[PDB]
Nucleic acid binder design. Structure first.
Ligand SMILES: [Cl-]
Ligand SMILES: [Zn+2]
Ligand SMILES: [Zn+2]
Ligand SMILES: [Zn+2]
Length: 122
DNA sequence: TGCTTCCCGCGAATAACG
DNA sequence: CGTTATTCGCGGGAAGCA
């Protein structure tokens, strides 16, 4: 196979055969296991780099386009990702975006073609 | 030690299937 | 096209880096 299961207290866990990492969702183990197999490739469409997860490539490509999707709603500054946005708000505004903040806006991705969540443009 | 990347549960978007 | 199976964007913590 590619995993085995483990059950404690009815809780079902899926364990990677290779590194023994534990997953609550089989789809997550599948997502993860590509790291070992490289069955699927995700090549950057701007340079040579290849990635083993779709999202690693996506985040990498955002760096190529320089799009800044995360905007601080307190002062208007924009950031390329959640982490810089959160870092900013905690440091400059002494507030936490965690949970439902209403402190930042995530703009739709426009600088390349990725699946669009409807909630991002209402 | 302040960035930077890596990770995984969750659930919306969509591809596969019949 | 209707169901379901699959993909992968998202949050936000953890791990890595130099
Ligand atoms: Cl922008
Ligand atoms: Zn593994
Ligand atoms: Zn690239
Ligand atoms: Zn701000």
């Amino acid at each position: 196979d590619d995993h085995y299961e483990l059950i404690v207290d009815g809780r079902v866990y899926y364990i990677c055969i290779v590194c023994k990492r534990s997953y609550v969702c089989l789809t997550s183990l599948r997502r993860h296991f590509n790291i070992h197999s490289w069955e699927k490739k995700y090549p950057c469409r701007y340079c040579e780099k290849v990635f083993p997860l779709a999202q690693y490539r996506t985040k990498h490509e955002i760096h190529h386009t320089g799009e800044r999707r995360y905007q601080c709603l307190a002062c208007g500054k924009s950031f390329i990702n959640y982490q810089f946005m959160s870092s900013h708000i905690k440091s400059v505004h002494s507030q936490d975006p965690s949970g439902d903040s209403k402190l930042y806006r995530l703009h739709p991705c426009r600088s390349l073609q990725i699946r669009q969540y409807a909630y991002l443009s209402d």
